[PDB]
Amino acid sequence: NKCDVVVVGGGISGMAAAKLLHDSGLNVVVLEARDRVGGRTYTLRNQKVKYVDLGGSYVGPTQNRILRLAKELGLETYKVNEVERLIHHVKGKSYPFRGPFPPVWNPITYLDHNNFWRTMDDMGREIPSDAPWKAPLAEEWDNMTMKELLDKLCWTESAKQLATLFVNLCVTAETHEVSALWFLWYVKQCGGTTRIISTTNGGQERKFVGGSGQVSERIMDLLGDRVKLERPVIYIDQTRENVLVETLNHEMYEAKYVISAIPPTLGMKIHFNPPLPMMRNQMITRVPLGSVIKCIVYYKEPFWRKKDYCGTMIIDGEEAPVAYTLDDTKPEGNYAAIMGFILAHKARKLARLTKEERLKKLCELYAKVLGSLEALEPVHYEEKNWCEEQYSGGCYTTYFPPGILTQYGRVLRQPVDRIYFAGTETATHWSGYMEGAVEAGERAAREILHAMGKIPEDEIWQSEPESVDVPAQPITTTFLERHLPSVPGLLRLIGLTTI
Amino acid sequence: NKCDVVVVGGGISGMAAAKLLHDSGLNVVVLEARDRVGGRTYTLRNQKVKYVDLGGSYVGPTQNRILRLAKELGLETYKVNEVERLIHHVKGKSYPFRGPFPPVWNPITYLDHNNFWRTMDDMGREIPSDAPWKAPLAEEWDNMTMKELLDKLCWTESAKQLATLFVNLCVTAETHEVSALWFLWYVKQCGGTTRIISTTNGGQERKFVGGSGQVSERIMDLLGDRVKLERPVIYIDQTRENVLVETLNHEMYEAKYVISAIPPTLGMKIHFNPPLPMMRNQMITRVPLGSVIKCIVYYKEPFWRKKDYCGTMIIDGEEAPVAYTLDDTKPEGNYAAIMGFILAHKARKLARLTKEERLKKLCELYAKVLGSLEALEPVHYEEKNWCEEQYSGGCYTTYFPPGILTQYGRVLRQPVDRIYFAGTETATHWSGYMEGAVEAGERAAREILHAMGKIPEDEIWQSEPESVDVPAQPITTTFLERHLPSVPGLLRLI
Ligand SMILES: *Cc1cc2c(cc1C)nc1c(=O)[nH]c(=O)nc-1n2C[C@H](O)[C@H](O)[C@H](O)COP(=O)(O)OP(=O)(O)OC[C@H]1O[C@@H](n2cnc3c(N)ncnc32)[C@H](O)[C@@H]1O
Ligand SMILES: *Cc1cc2c(cc1C)nc1c(=O)[nH]c(=O)nc-1n2C[C@H](O)[C@H](O)[C@H](O)COP(=O)(O)OP(=O)(O)OC[C@H]1O[C@@H](n2cnc3c(N)ncnc32)[C@H](O)[C@@H]1O
Ligand SMILES: CCCCCCCCCCCC[N+](C)(C)CCCS(=O)(=O)O
Ligand SMILES: c1ccc2oc(-c3ncc[nH]3)cc2c1
Ligand SMILES: c1ccc2oc(-c3ncc[nH]3)cc2c1
Ligand SMILES: O=C1Nc2ccccc2C1=O
Ligand SMILES: O=C1Nc2ccccc2C1=O
C-alpha cells in the first residue's frame, strides 16, 4: 500500500501510464473501480459470438500509439469490411455509393456540400490541437452551438441533414448540445473530416483480433497484483508529505504522485483535501459524456455482401433507431453481424424498450435499408447502453457545451499539486479514442518522471513513429474541390455579373 | 446509527425537511459535509460588519414559505434601501431613474426594450411551472441558447446589452451558456420579469435581521445532536431491507428512507449501490451551477444617500467588474456598505487577483458610478467566491445548458427507490432561492410521510398562506406597454 504512483482508473490510459512507470523501474498501483480493467473498452466473450467489442473497437491510420502498444502486447488487427458498396438511406430510400461522402448531383447542392466539409476543415486549421482556446475567433466560435454553425453554413437542407448525422455519430450528442469551437477542434485533432469519418484510410479501418479489451487485460497480466479491482477511489488528501488515496472498500494507499486516468467529470466522485482550485472544481461539473447504445445483430450469413453491400449504412430520419452501421463479421467470414449505434437523444428515447423490442426495431430497419427480408432473421443479439455506467458516465467521450472550452479548457490537464491528469479527454491527437488514451497516459507518466528528476522537460511530450503495418495515405483534395465557390459565393458572383 | 430518515445536506432545504419530519415525530439525522450548516447561505459575524450575508440574503413578496419558516424561528426582516434614485451606468455615464427598468427615450429603442420584457413574460405563460418540458414549444426553445433568443428578439444593441445584464444577474451565467426554455421557465416561476428584478415588491425587497444563516443555525439548534457536521456522504446502498448511508469519516447510518438535499450535480460525489438509473446517472453530469463573487465594501456613512442615490447601480460594459449593486447598510443606518456581484465570466477572470486588488477595482468603479471620491475610502471589505466551494459547486443555483431540460428535467425530482429529492433546484416556485429550498424540503419530507401511509397523496404538495408582514402587491402593465408594436411589428406597417 506504499508505492511511487497511484493510477486511478484501469482503462487503456491508466494501464498505459502504469506500464510506462513500471517499465521505468517505479512501484505503481492501479486502483480500478470495476471488477475488470478496460473501462470504455469491453470485450464480451460467449459461445454465440466468440468475442465482441461492446465499447471502443476501431483503430486506423495515424493512430500510431495504440497500434504500437497493441503490437508490443502481441495483438493483431484486421480490416473492417468495405469491399462492397456503402448505402446512404435518406427520405425512406437507399442509394448505394463509394467514397468518403455520398455523391451529390444537383450542382447547387454539390457546391453547398463541398463548401461545408471544406469550411469545417478550414476553420479547424485555425485551432491549435494543444490549445483550442487560442484560436483567433475562439470566443465567437465557442459561444455558438454546432446547430447555429450548420444553420449559418448550410444553404441546403441536404447538407444540414448530413452534417447533423456527422456530428451525432462523431460525438454521440446533438448539434444544439455542443460548442462549435470544441466540435471543430475535435474533428481537426482527428485529422479532419475525411479522416474521422472514413473506414478505409480513416478512424474505422481496423479492429483487433479477439477484441480491444485485450489491451488493458494484457497490461494487467504484465503488472500482476499491482492492479486492484473493485477499488473505487473516494478521497485524495495532499495535505501531508505523501499523498493518501482512499478507496470505497476501506483501503488506504500512500504515494509520491497520483495520475487521475478517469473521465474528467468522474473526478466529482472523489472528495479532495484540500479542495480543488476554483477552475477545476467548476470544470468537472461542466463536461458531460455523450449517449450511445452499441448494438450487434447476428445472422447466419453476411447476406448483404451478396447484394453488393458492405454493411455500412448511413441512415437519416427521426424514425430510424440506428443512424450508422458497419459490418462486424469476423475476419474468417463467420459470426456474421451488423454493428449499429443508437445515438444521442435516441439512446435516451429507446432505452425504455426491452432488448427484444430494440432487436425488432433494428431488424425492421435493416430489412428496409438493405431491401432484404433476410434481415428479419437474426440468430443472436448483443448490446450495451453506455449511458447506464456509473464509472464511465456515457460514451464515446466528453463533450463541451457552449462557452466551456474557452473558460475552463486550460485546466483540463493542469496538475493539481501532485495529481497529474491522463485519460483520453486530455489528449491532443485523437482525444476521445483509444489512441488519445495512450497519448495521455504516457504523457502524464512522463510528467511524473520529469517531476522526479528522471527525464528532462523536453521528453514529456514524445512523437510516435508511424506504424509500418498501418501506413496512412494523405488526405488530398482537387483543384475544383479547393476553389469552387460556396452558395453565397456563387450568389455574390451572379450579383456582380448582373453589373 | 439507526433512524427513520437520513437527510443528506444541512442547507435550508435539508433543514426544512428534517424539521418537518422531526415535528411529525420521526427520528431524523442530518448528515452535513461542512463544519457548518446553511450551505449556499453563510452569515459571517465580526465587529467590523456586525453580521453580513456572504451567500443568499434577500427575501420578498410571494416567498411565503421561507417568510413563515423564518418567522417561526424568531427572525424579522427589514427593507433593503430603495428610497432614493437608482442608477443605470452605460457607456461611461450615470443616468439616475426609478422603476423596474431604466427609461429609454429613442422611440425605436423604446419599442425594442418594451417588446423584449413583454415577450419574455408572454413566452413564460406557455411554460408549466411544474413541467417546463411540457411547454408547447419545449424542444424548439430548449435547443436554443438565451444568446440566440436575444439575437432573434432584440433589434437594438441597447436592448440586447440590458437583456444580457438581466440574464447574467438572475442566473450568474452567460447568455450563450443557458437554454432559452430553462431561462424562460426560471423567470416565470419567480413571477415574471418585474417580480424577479425588483427590490420594492420583488425578490430583493428584504433581508433578515442578523443574517439568513440563522434559518439553518436555528433549525440545527432545535434538532441538537441529530445534525452531524463534517459528515460528507460517500455511499448509499439500497440493496437491503433498510438504506445504508456511509460518510467519509467512516460512519454508517441506517434508515428507512433518505432525502437528498444537495445541488443535483453534487450527487456525483456519492457512489450508489445499485447504480442509479440511466437517466439520473447522466443528468447529474449535465447540470452545472453558475459563477459569482459576492463583494461587500463598507464605508463610514451611506454617502450616496446625500446625493439622492439609493445605492442600486446597474453597470454595463466589459471593463466594470461588478454589474449590479444594492445598498447593504444595516437598518439602523450604520455599517454603511454596498453589496455588488462579480458575475459569470468575470468571476472566473477576476478570481486571479488578490482581495485588495479586487477592493481597489470596486472602489474606483463605484467612485465613477456614484460620482463621489468618498467611494475611494473603504473602511472594511468582505467577499466570497462561490466558485471555490467543493460542496456547493457555485452560486446561486444550477443552470441547464441547451437541450438538457427537455431530455432530463423529468428526472430531477423522481424518487430512486427510497431516496427522495429536495434542494431548491427541485422547487416549482422560486427554485434557485431560499423560498424554493423550503418548498422542496417540505414536499420531499411529505412524499416520505405519504410513502409511510401517514398522510394522503393530496397532502404531498401544500399551498402557503400569504405572509402578513410582507404582502404582495399586483404587478401591472400600462395600455401602451401591452399594445405598442415591436420593431419588426412597426416595419410590417411600412
Ligand atoms: C463506449 C464506447 C467508446 C468508444 C466507442 C464506442 C463506444 C460504445 N468507439 C470507439 C472506437 O471504435 N475506437 C476508439 O478508439 N475509441 C472508441 N470509443 C472510445 C474509447 O472507448 C475511449 O476513448 C477509451 O477507452 C478511453 O480510455 P480512458 O482510459 O481514457 O478512459 P476509461 O476507459 O473510461 O477508463 C477509466 C477507468 O477508470 C475507472 N474509474 C472511474 N471512476 C473511478 C474511481 N473513482 N476510482 C477508480 N477507478 C475509476 C473506470 O471504471 C475505468 O476502467
Ligand atoms: C451563493 C449565493 C446564493 C444566493 C444568492 C447569492 C449567492 C452569492 N442570493 C440569494 C438571495 O439573495 N436570495 C435567495 O433566496 N437565494 C439566493 N441565493 C441562492 C440560495 O442561497 C440557495 O437557493 C439556497 O441556499 C439553496 O438551499 P439548498 O438547501 O437547496 O442547498 P444548499 O444550500 O447548497 O445546501 C446543500 C447542503 O448539502 C451539503 N452537502 C453537499 N454535498 C454533501 C455530501 N456529499 N454529504 C453531505 N452534505 C453535503 C452542503 O455543504 C450544503 O450545506
Ligand atoms: C432582393 C434580394 C433579396 C435576397 C436576400 C437574400 C436572403 C438571404 C437569406 C438566406 C439565409 C441562408 N442561411 C444559410 C440560412 C443563413 C446564411 C447566413 S449568412 O447570411 O451567410 O451570414
Ligand atoms: C455523415 C454521417 C456518417 C458518415 O459516414 C461516412 C462514411 N463512412 C465510410 C465512408 N464515409 C460519411 C458520413 C457522413
Ligand atoms: C437589467 C439588469 C439589472 C436590473 O435591475 C433592475 C432593477 N433593479 C431594481 C428595479 N429594477 C432592472 C434591471 C434590468
Ligand atoms: O465506432 C465509431 N466511432 C466513430 C467515431 C466517429 C465516426 C464514426 C465512428 C464509428 O463508427
Ligand atoms: O442577490 C440577488 N439575487 C438576484 C436574483 C435576480 C435579480 C437580482 C438579484 C440579486 O440582487
UniProtKB/Swiss-Prot annotation, chain B:
It is a single-pass type IV membrane protein. The keyword Acetylation applies. Coiled coil: none annotated. Belongs to the flavin monoamine oxidase family. GO terms for cellular component: mitochondrial envelope; mitochondrial outer membrane; mitochondrion. The gene is MAOB. Inhibited by deprenyl. Its EC number is 1.4.3.21, 1.4.3.4. Its cofactor is FAD. The lineage of its organism: Eukaryota, Metazoa, Chordata, Craniata, Vertebrata. It catalyses: a secondary aliphatic amine + O2 + H2O = a primary amine + an aldehyde + H2O2; (R)-adrenaline + O2 + H2O = (R)-3,4-dihydroxymandelaldehyde + methylamine + H2O2; a primary methyl amine + O2 + H2O = an aldehyde + H2O2 + NH4(+); benzylamine + O2 + H2O = benzaldehyde + H2O2 + NH4(+). It comes from the Eukaryota. Changing C170S: No loss of activity. GO terms for biological process: dopamine catabolic process; hydrogen peroxide biosynthetic process; substantia nigra development. Its main location: mitochondrion. This is Amine oxidase [flavin-containing] B.
